[PDB]
PDB file of C-alpha atoms in Angstrom:
ATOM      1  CA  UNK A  20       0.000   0.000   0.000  1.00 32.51           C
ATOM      2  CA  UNK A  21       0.910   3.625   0.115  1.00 31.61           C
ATOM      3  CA  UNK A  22      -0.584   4.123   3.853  1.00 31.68           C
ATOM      4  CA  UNK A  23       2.362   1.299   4.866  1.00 34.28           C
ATOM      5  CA  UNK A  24       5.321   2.725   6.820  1.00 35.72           C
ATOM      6  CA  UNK A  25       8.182   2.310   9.198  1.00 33.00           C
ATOM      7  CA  UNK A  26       8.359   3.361  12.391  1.00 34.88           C
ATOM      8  CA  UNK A  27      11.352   5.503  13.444  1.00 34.23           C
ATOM      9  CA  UNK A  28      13.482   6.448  16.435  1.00 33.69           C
ATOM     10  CA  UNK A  29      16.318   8.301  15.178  1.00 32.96           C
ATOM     11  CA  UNK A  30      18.244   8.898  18.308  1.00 31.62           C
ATOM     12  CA  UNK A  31      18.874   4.213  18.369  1.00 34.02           C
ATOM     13  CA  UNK A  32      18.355   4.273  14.410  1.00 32.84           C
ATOM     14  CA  UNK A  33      15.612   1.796  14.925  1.00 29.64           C
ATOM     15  CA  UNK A  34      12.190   0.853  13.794  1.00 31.36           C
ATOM     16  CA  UNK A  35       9.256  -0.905  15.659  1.00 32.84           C
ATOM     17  CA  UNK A  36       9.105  -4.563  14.522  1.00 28.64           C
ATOM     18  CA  UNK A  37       5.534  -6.616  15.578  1.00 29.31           C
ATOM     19  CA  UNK A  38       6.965  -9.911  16.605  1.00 26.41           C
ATOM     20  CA  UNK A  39       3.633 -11.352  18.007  1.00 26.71           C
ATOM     21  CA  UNK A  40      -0.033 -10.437  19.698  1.00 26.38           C
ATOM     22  CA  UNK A  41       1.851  -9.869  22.792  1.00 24.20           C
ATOM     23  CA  UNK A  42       5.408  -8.414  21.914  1.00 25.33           C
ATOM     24  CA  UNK A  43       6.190  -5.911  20.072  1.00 27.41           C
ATOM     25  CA  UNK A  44      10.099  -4.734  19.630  1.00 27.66           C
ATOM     26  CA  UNK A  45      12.542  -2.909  17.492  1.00 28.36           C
ATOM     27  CA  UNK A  46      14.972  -3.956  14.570  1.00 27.50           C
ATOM     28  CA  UNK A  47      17.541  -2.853  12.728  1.00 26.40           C
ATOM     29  CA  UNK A  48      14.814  -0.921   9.460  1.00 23.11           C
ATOM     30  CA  UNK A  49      14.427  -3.155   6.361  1.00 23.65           C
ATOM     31  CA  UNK A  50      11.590  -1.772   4.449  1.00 19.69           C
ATOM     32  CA  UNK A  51      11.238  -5.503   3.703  1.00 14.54           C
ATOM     33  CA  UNK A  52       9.717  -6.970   6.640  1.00 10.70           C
ATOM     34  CA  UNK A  53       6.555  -7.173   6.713  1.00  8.67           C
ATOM     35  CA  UNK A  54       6.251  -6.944  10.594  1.00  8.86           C
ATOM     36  CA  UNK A  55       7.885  -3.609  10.318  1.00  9.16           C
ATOM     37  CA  UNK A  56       5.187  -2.228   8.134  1.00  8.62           C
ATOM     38  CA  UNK A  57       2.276  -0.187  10.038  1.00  4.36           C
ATOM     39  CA  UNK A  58      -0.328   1.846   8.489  1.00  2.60           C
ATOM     40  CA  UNK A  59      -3.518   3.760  10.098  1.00  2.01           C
ATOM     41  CA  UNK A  60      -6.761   2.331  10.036  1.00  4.93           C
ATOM     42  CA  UNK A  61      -8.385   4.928  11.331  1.00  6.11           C
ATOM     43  CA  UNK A  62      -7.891   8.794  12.888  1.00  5.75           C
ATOM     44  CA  UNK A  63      -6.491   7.280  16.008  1.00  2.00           C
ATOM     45  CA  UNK A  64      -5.516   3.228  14.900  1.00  2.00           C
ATOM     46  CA  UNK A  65      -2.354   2.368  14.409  1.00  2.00           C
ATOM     47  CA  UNK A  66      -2.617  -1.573  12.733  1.00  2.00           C
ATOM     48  CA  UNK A  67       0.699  -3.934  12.267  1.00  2.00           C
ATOM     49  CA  UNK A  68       0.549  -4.836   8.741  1.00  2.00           C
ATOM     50  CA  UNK A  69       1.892  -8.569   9.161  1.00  2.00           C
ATOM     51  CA  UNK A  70      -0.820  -9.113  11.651  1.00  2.00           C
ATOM     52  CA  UNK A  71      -3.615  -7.431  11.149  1.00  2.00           C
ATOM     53  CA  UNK A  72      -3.953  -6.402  14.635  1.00  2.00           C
ATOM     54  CA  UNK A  73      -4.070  -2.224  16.316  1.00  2.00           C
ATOM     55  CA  UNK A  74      -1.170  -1.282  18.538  1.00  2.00           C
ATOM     56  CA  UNK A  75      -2.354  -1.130  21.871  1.00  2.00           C
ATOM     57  CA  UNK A  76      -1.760  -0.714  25.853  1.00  2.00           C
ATOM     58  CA  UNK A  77      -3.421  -3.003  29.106  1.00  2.00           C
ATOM     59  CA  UNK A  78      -4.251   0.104  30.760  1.00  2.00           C
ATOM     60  CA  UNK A  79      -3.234   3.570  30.738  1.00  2.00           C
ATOM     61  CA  UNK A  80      -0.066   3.178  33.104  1.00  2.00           C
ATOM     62  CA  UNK A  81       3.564   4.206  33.016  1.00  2.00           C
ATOM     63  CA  UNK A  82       5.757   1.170  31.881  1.00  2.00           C
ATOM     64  CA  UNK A  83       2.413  -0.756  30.315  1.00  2.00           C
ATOM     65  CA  UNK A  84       3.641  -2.452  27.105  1.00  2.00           C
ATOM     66  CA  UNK A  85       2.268  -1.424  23.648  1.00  2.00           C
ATOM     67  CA  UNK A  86       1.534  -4.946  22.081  1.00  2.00           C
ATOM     68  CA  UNK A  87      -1.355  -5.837  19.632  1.00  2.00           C
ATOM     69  CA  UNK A  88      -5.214  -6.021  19.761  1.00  2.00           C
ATOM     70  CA  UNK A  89      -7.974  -6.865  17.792  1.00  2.00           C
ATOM     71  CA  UNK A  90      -8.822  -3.563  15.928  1.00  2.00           C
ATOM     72  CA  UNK A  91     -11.985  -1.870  17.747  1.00  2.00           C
ATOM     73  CA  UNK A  92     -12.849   1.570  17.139  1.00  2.00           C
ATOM     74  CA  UNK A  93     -14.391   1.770  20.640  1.00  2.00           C
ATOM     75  CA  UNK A  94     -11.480   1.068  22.708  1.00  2.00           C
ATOM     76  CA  UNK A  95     -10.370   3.586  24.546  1.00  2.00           C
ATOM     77  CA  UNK A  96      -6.839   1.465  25.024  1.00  2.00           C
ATOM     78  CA  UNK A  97      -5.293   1.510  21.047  1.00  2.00           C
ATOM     79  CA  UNK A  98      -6.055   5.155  20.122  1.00  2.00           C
ATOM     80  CA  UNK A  99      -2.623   7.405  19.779  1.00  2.00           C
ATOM     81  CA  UNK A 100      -2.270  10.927  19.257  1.00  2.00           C
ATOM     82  CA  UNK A 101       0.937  13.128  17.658  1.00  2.00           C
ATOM     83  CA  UNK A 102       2.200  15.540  20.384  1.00  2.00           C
ATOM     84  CA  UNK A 103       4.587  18.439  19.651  1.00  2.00           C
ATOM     85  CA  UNK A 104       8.159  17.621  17.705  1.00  2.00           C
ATOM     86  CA  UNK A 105       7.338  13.807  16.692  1.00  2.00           C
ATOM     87  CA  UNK A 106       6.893  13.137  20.033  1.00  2.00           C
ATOM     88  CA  UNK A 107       4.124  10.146  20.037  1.00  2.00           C
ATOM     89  CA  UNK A 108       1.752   8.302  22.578  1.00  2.00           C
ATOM     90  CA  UNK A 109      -1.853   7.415  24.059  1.00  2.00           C
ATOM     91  CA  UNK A 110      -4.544   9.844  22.860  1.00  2.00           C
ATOM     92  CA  UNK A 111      -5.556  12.155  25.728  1.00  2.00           C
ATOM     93  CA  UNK A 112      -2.536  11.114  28.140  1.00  2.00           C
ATOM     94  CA  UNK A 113       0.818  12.227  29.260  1.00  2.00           C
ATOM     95  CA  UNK A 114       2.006   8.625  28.305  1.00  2.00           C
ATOM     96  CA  UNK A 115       4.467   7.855  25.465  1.00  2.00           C
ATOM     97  CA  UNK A 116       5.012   5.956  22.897  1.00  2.00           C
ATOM     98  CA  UNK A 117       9.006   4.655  24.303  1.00  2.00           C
ATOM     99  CA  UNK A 118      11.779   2.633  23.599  1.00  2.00           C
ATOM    100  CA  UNK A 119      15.374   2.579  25.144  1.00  2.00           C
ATOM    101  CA  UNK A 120      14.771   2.387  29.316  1.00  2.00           C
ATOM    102  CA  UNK A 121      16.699  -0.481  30.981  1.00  2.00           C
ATOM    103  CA  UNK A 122      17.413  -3.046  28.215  1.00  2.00           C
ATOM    104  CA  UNK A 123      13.817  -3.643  28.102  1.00  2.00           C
ATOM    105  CA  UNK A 124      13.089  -5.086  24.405  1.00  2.00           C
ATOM    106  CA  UNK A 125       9.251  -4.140  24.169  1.00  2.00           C
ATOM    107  CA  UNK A 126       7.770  -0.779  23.312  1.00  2.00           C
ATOM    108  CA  UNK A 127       6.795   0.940  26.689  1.00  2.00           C
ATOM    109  CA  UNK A 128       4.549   4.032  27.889  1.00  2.00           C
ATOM    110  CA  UNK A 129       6.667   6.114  29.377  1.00  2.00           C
ATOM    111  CA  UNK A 130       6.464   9.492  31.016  1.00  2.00           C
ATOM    112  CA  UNK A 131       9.790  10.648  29.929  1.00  2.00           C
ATOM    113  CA  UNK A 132       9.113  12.985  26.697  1.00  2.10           C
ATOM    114  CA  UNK A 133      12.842  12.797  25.405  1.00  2.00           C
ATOM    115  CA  UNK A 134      14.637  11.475  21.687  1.00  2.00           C
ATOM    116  CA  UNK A 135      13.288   7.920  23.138  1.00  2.00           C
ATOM    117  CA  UNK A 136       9.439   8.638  23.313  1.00  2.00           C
ATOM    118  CA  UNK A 137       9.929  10.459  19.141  1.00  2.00           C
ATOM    119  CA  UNK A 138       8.989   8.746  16.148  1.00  2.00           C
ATOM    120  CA  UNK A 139       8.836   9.576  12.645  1.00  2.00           C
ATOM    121  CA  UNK A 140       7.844   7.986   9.453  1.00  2.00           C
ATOM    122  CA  UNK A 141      10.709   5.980   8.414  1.00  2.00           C
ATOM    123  CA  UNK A 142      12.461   7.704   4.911  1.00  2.00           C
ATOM    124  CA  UNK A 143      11.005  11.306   6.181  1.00  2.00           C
ATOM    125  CA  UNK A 144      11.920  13.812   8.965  1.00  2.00           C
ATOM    126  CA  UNK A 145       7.768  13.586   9.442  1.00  2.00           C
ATOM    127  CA  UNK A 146       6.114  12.553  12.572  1.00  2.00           C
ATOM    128  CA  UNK A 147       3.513   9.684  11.902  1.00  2.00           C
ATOM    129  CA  UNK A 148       0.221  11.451  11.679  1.00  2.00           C
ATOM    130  CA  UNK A 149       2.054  12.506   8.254  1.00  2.00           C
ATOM    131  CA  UNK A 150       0.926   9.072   6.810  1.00  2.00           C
ATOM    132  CA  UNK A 151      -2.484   9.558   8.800  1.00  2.00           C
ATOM    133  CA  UNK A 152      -6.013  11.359   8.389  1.00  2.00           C
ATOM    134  CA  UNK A 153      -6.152  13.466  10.793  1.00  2.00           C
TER     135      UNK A 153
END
């Protein structure tokens, strides 16, 4: 498609890479791989492309991991927001979109609003709402 993309931190040089329902990681960017290709499904969806499933959170809590869920418009759990400067997390909260905190492997929410909680649109110096609707 032409909504796919790559999810990029440029401070590690690394893009989010769906490894299963319940983890979700990072990999060295090959836009390739399947399970590094994302696209929006919606104004606030975020769906892995290699399995059909919406990024999403437990609860809205610092250190929850961002793994996937079935796609459901209603949740209030999988809808993410741009913030200011590519900075990225849960719609409505203080919570971000994070990777890079003690060797932990899995995408995190995290309070901290530094390089490690920025994304952009892998190939662009865009945040990811670029390849959005909103």
């Amino acid at each position: 498609d032409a909504r796919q993309f790559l999810i990029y931190n440029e401070d590690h040089k690394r893009c989010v890479d769906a490894l299963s329902a319940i983890s979700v990681q990072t990999a060295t960017c090959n836009p390739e791989a399947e399970s590094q290709k994302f696209r929006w499904v919606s104004d606030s969806q975020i769906m892995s492309v290699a399995f059909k499933l919406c990024l999403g959170v437990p609860s809205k809590t610092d250190w929850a991991s961002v793994t996937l869920y079935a796609c459901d418009s209603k949740s209030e759990y999988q809808k993410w927001e741009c913030k200011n400067d590519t900075l990225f997390g849960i719609k409505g909260t203080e919570l971000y979109f994070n990777y890079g905190n003690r060797q932990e492997k899995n995408i995190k929410l995290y309070k901290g609003s530094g390089l490690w909680s920025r994304w952009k649109v892998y190939g662009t110096t865009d945040d990811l709402c670029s390849r959005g609707y909103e």
